[PDB]
Ligand SMILES: CS(=O)(=O)NCCNc1cc(C(=O)O)ccn1
Ligand SMILES: [Cl-]
Ligand code: NI
């Protein structure tokens with residue numbers, strides 16, 4: 001068995017290996033990459049996403065989200081308070097202001113310690129989930145706006161056409177902005193490209209151990225767990241690496257830098273934070289191996305988790321017994 005300890009693997013494809021996206025995902029899995037839940041891909045030196053980032057300041061962040069924490073330093077939830085619209089140029093200036101800028105630090109480990117010590121005492125503002133793309137249309141390799149669609153994958157594997165579209169999203173971050181513990185909708189894959197700026201640190205639980213994280217979360221967030229049997233799908237709960245280690249939860253960590261891709265695999269729980277002003281682009285995708293995960297994925301039906309129009313058909317076709325109850329939740 002490849003990668004039996006479930007370590008995060010790092011890949012360096014050549015320019016020729018970077019041509020066929022599906023083929024390279026399958027290659028990574030043949031080496032055991034999916035057992036970690038997350039892999040890093042460093043593009044060949046000949047590749048570029050676009051020519052420059054000098055002309056992005058007029059993009060609008062229509063609803064910046066202030067991430068307000070409750071709890072204790074290592075076990076907390078966050079809620080999102082909507083703020084007035086601002087451009088990317090205005091957001092970058094805000095991220096770099098004395099109130100929000102990254103503190104002095106010696107290395108990524110020092111900054112990680114500062115994050116877990118001090119995150120709850122501040123409320124950073126995240127420009128998350130903006131529909132759009134920063135890839136140049138002439139970039140033909142690993143262009144997140146030109147991947148095969150999940151709807152076409154389901155049709156190819158199972159035989160019928162479904163409605164729906166999926167397109168990429170942009171995330172403009174600042175110091176301490178946080179993504180909570182979650183798997184993707186319907187336990188899909190995701191791919192994330194860090195276009196510009198300061199790093200993004202990731203934590204991940206191997207898919208084979210995801211239930212261990214779920215059990216700990218129910219113990220640590222007892223009211224939330226009573227309200228919804230899949231409450232991690234609300235994307236609001238944080239648990240620190242120290243607390244995970246105290247409870248014996250298997251996990252790994254890695255820092256992503258500008259110019260690097262991260263792929264999350266089906267049922268790979270992940271969480272993390274931004275080091276400073278940055279911009280990432282992300283999209284969900286599927287492969288033939290995803291189908292059995294989609295068939296078994298848990299659902300939030302309590303009302304909290306977001307309406308995503310494309311998920312309707314995935315539940316309808318893969319989980320017909322659950323569809324009626326799930327639909328009432330939407
Ligand atoms: C911000 S959230 O906690 O309300 N929703 C999190 C949505 N999922 C994500 C977000 C990131 C990211 O921010 O880079 C990376 C991977 N998965
Ligand atoms: Cl700090
Ligand atoms: Ni995610």
Ligand SMILES: [Zn+2]
Pocket residue numbers: 227228229230231234300301302303304305
């Ligand atoms: Zn729920």
